[PDB]
Enzyme design. Structure first.
Site, PDB file in Angstrom:
ATOM      1  N   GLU A  35      -8.354  -3.923 -15.074  1.00 44.07           N
ATOM      2  CA  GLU A  35      -6.998  -4.016 -14.533  1.00 44.07           C
ATOM      3  C   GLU A  35      -5.951  -3.521 -15.537  1.00 44.07           C
ATOM      4  O   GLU A  35      -5.071  -2.724 -15.185  1.00 44.07           O
ATOM      5  CB  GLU A  35      -6.689  -5.465 -14.125  1.00 44.07           C
ATOM      6  N   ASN A  46       3.067   0.432  -7.334  1.00 43.16           N
ATOM      7  CA  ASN A  46       2.291   0.685  -6.132  1.00 43.16           C
ATOM      8  C   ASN A  46       3.127   1.475  -5.136  1.00 43.16           C
ATOM      9  O   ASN A  46       4.362   1.441  -5.150  1.00 43.16           O
ATOM     10  CB  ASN A  46       1.847  -0.622  -5.466  1.00 43.16           C
ATOM     11  N   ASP A  48       3.786   0.880  -2.010  1.00 48.08           N
ATOM     12  CA  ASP A  48       4.693   0.083  -1.188  1.00 48.08           C
ATOM     13  C   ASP A  48       5.851  -0.492  -1.989  1.00 48.08           C
ATOM     14  O   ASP A  48       6.483  -1.466  -1.560  1.00 48.08           O
ATOM     15  CB  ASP A  48       3.934  -1.059  -0.523  1.00 48.08           C
ATOM     16  N   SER A  50       5.814  -2.299  -4.492  1.00 47.38           N
ATOM     17  CA  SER A  50       5.389  -3.441  -5.280  1.00 47.38           C
ATOM     18  C   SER A  50       4.788  -2.963  -6.592  1.00 47.38           C
ATOM     19  O   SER A  50       4.342  -1.819  -6.732  1.00 47.38           O
ATOM     20  CB  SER A  50       4.333  -4.253  -4.532  1.00 47.38           C
ATOM     21  N   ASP A  52       2.225  -4.132 -10.038  1.00 47.30           N
ATOM     22  CA  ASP A  52       1.256  -5.028 -10.682  1.00 47.30           C
ATOM     23  C   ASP A  52       1.717  -5.315 -12.105  1.00 47.30           C
ATOM     24  O   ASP A  52       2.182  -4.408 -12.805  1.00 47.30           O
ATOM     25  CB  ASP A  52      -0.115  -4.352 -10.733  1.00 47.30           C
ATOM     26  N   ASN A  59       0.263  -8.724  -8.396  1.00 51.82           N
ATOM     27  CA  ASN A  59       1.047  -7.852  -7.523  1.00 51.82           C
ATOM     28  C   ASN A  59       2.260  -8.581  -6.944  1.00 51.82           C
ATOM     29  O   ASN A  59       2.156  -9.709  -6.471  1.00 51.82           O
ATOM     30  CB  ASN A  59       0.139  -7.340  -6.401  1.00 51.82           C
TER      31      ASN A  59
END
Length: 127
Positions: A35, A46, A48, A50, A52, A59
């Protein structure tokens, strides 16, 4: 900070992750490797909108509030910014809520694709 593998393993063990909700410590170390490459300050945007955040790439669509993600649910009741500490407590506490939400570790895309199915205890071998 960038943890070493066994350094992180020992910190996660101290924070209660070994065998938490059925997931052995090696699952969590493998997850962090893929990760964030063990970096507590890692962040990745991301599609959308969003983002992380942190060592376990939590997220903001569901888990934390970053003031800029619509559809925020903030299920961990934490500002995303707080997950970028060198101390792993806030990320671990959120991780515990995620894995309890009723779908195992499958929420972590890197774990589901790159750890699940493998000999995960190799990640704590030698520690």
């Amino acid at each position: 900070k960038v943890f070493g593998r066994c350094e992180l393993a020992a910190a996660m063990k101290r924070h209660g992750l070994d065998n938490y909700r059925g997931y052995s410590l090696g699952n969590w170390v493998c997850a962090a490797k893929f990760e964030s490459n063990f970096n507590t300050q890692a962040t990745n945007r991301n599609t959308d909108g969003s983002t992380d955040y942190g060592i376990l790439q939590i997220n903001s669509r569901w888990w934390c509030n970053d003031g800029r993600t619509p559809g925020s649910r903030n299920l961990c009741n934490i500002p995303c910014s707080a997950l970028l500490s060198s101390d792993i407590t806030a990320s671990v506490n959120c991780a515990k809520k995620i894995v309890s939400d009723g779908n195992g570790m499958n929420a972590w895309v890197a774990w589901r694709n790159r750890c699940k199915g493998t000999d995960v205890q190799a990640w704590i071998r030698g520690c």
